Structure 1
Amino acid sequence: ERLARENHSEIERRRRNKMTAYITELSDMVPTCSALARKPDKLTILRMAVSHMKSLSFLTDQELKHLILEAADGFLFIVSCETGRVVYVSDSVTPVLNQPQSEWFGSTLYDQVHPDDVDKLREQLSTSRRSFICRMRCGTPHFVVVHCTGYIKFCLVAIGRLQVTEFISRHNIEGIFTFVDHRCVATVGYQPQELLGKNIVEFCHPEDQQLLRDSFQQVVKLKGQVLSVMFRFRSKTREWLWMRTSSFTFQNPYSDEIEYIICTNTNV
């Protein structure tokens, strides 16, 4: 009994705060009140509200078209289920793909996707609703990654939308090359297989190699935290190269156990 009175009176207070704040929220939303000299009688405030409201479900399909265009670089298209030929495409195809509609309208979808995707395409056209991922043209060839979302009714209706000097290496605790970037060959003129399967210090300079060893020691010691080390490095032109390598221990997000040392290797 004596635990409801307070609870309620304060629930009520919450309601008053909330609601009167709703009113003063609506006040500065209807032109007439926001322009008006001072605050009007709540009653008259929302008299004005009704009167303005009538002066206009929630949005028209046109409005929400606009809306979801401003929510995704994307466009609508319709294609016959099992011939591939395009039937409709929204104009938004041009600001998304640079494709004239005279071009895109005639076409078959298969002749608009990435070649090796065509197989995957017909897989998604065999007779509920469907959704998948493909690559598409760009015109004026650099293709673009387009997510696709649609259904079946005869033909298929859907919407496509697009998602918006140095080199990198992975080692284990010993320093053994585990992964090596391809751009490495530009950096030090080496072929990854001439790097994989063996350590890194044998590429460092005789009077620097200790800095390497104990720096790796610190990297694993300094769990997760970054640290850089400068040293000299054998190119395959026999020539030596200075090197700022930034490394840090990767420990698994779940298990926080070592996986590999990630080093971003830069020349200075």
Structure 2
Amino acid sequence: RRSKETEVFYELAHELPLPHSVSSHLDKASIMRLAISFLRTHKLLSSVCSMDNLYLKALEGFIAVVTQDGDMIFLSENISKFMGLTQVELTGHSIFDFTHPCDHEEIRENLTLSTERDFFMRMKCTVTVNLKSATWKVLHCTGQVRVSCLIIMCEPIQHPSHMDIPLDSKTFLSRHSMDMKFTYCDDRILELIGYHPEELLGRSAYEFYHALDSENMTKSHQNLCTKGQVVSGQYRMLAKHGGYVWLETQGTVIYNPRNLQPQCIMCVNYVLSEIEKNDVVFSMDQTES
């Protein structure tokens, strides 16, 4: 009689929105977690709206729904693509158990109480290996808190060494000391804003910001260092002649492999514009001649 209740699990497991490859393979506790989280899921969905291979694939990050009590009630399938950890392994469980603990207070705050949220978290990654040997991975998380419940997208930032995607002419690349001082720049830099890298080698990046941006950026630098990666808000960089060009950068700390000491920041820089105020000269560097 145990025999069958056990087998009843199987029909249940199967007719979750999961393939039998991933439905069949379950100890029951899992099936519990899962059934319920699915329900709750459907519930708040109803609370919102008052063949789908493409959304999933088109994505570069995954969606998570989490209670205010931290329970990761929903998780995208393709999370495994990014985190390795497969949605079945996680749903129902507390976020904190899988997030870097120092980053948890931040987590706690964004969970609670403008309903808008944007922050970075380090989460366990196993891509592939097992969890004991699970290294941390930064997720840019962007979403909305609702009724308490947090709904987000978690976009891994990508690592400049290991490209998954093509670049275009309006993208250039730069290397910087921890100081943010340039150490390297590709010479699309020239094509794009006018500076020749030999000029900018000795220089802290800070000299090229338009000021309004500075603050927005400082936090970014800080986050770049506490977590090891960042995506900047959009900001203006001063072009070599007057005016500036809008920008967004993916900062990524690279370590010395033999040394495990950090070496520099690798910046994927995205130029969003042409020079806007050719007319206006802002800083002493644009003034020569």
Fold conserved (TM > 0.5)? Answer: no
Query: TM-score band (shorter)?
Result: 0.3 to 0.5
How high is the TM-score relative to the length of structure 1?
0.36
**What TM-score comes out, normalization by structure 2 length?**
0.34
